Amino acid sequence: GAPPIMGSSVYITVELAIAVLAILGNVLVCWAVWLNSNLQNVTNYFVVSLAAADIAVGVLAIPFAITISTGFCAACHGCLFIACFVLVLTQSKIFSLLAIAIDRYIAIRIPLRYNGLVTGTRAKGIIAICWVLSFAIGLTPMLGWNNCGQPKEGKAHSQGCGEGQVACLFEDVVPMNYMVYFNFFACVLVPLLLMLGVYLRIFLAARRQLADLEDNWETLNDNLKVIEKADNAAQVKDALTKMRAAALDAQKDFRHGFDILVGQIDDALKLANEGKVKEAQAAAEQLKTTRNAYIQKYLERARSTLQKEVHAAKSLAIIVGLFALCWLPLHIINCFTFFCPDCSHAPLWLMYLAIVLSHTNSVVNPFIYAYRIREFRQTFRKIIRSHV
Ligand SMILES: CC(C)CCC[C@@H](C)[C@H]1CC[C@H]2[C@@H]3CC=C4C[C@@H](O)CC[C@]4(C)[C@H]3CC[C@]12C
Ligand SMILES: CC(C)CCC[C@@H](C)[C@H]1CC[C@H]2[C@@H]3CC=C4C[C@@H](O)CC[C@]4(C)[C@H]3CC[C@]12C
């Protein structure tokens, strides 16, 4: 069979290529948020915790991965730490992603209270807590859910390992029920599904809010039509009680538009509760000069912001769908290894490829920002032009 240093040299070189890009891309993210106070929101503190976990993939997890494919003689628990450190960092990224979905959900659903609820100080406390939980979850095998107690000793003597040592291989020290049940199903897959729901709720609340907005608009204008085209005084009253309510509704330079608007409706309602039909129909035309000059322009900045929230949460959902794509192959292969012991194990080369793919996720997030977030892309250019 072919000398394995040939296939390894390829896998290593690829891994190092990827570590290089991971560091750069994600240092630039971080340098970006540091420098551009437009990018200094709570949402982006999570983006930074995400970029830092990806820098750490290049600086550490990927060298660890290179190390543990050699099979080098190593004390079992030390081999377990270099095997598990990547699980810690990946768990950090799930928490950061979930935090971002939730943040964006709070932002669209209770925009009024978002500044007072989601503050820079609570964000940073959540980030710290999640990093501690990621170390706990990711290094749980250290605490005894491992295969250290049953070393492959024929394989350790074949390699001259010291007494106390193992060939340091991932599938030899980390149990596959840990990886399938605990790490995949419960600590990755369940969080992804969750993140998937949150984003459904965001797109629904935006879809609904925009609906309400353009409904209200049409109440405003159809009740005007009812008024031009009545010839009876209690018709006009009925249509202005409705206009009025549909105005204190949409309420919740801006306010002088609704001040005027409800005022003119209070003017015209009052004519109409006197029987002056024509006097009130031409009073309820004064509204139209007020819609044209104020209400249409609140309609429109409010639609603008919702379309911006929607587009932002699609950008962020793409970050989560690419996480899924990069990591799923590897889990899906572990599922086969574990659930079908009748099946031949996936070949070495594919293991290599699933692992490499999982690591490329540490290169995608920076490209996403740059293609999808005008403020990150403008800031990427300033840094790239001024320094290179
Ligand atoms: C601040 C950063 C750079 C610290 C990096 C520390 C890393 C490189 C260290 C910390 C703990 C170390 C491990 C501790 C124990 C063992 C068992 C031994 O039989 C082989 C080496 C091995 C597997 C070590 C490899 C290197 C290691 C993972
Ligand atoms: C998320 C997207 C990209 C889908 C991922 C599909 C990949 C991971 C799937 C599709 C077909 C799968 C293979 C189908 C059959 C076998 C034979 C078995 O003896 C070992 C596992 C192995 C080799 C599977 C490994 C995982 C596999 C390659």
Ligand SMILES: CC(C)CCC[C@@H](C)[C@H]1CC[C@H]2[C@@H]3CC=C4C[C@@H](O)CC[C@]4(C)[C@H]3CC[C@]12C
């Ligand atoms: C949305 C999707 C990607 C969620 C995850 C799907 C996973 C859990 C599913 C998709 C395909 C499934 C595999 C399909 C075929 C086999 C072969 C059988 O002998 C053991 C179960 C096993 C190995 C399944 C395990 C679970 C599996 C890997």
Ligand SMILES: N#Cc1c(N)nc(SCc2ncc[nH]2)c(C#N)c1-c1ccc(O)cc1
């Ligand atoms: N599974 C799994 C798994 C595995 N069997 N091997 C390795 S490295 C040994 C090796 N390198 C090339 C061929 N074999 C790694 C790593 N890192 C994982 C792994 C596990 C969880 C992750 O979040 C990321 C990666």
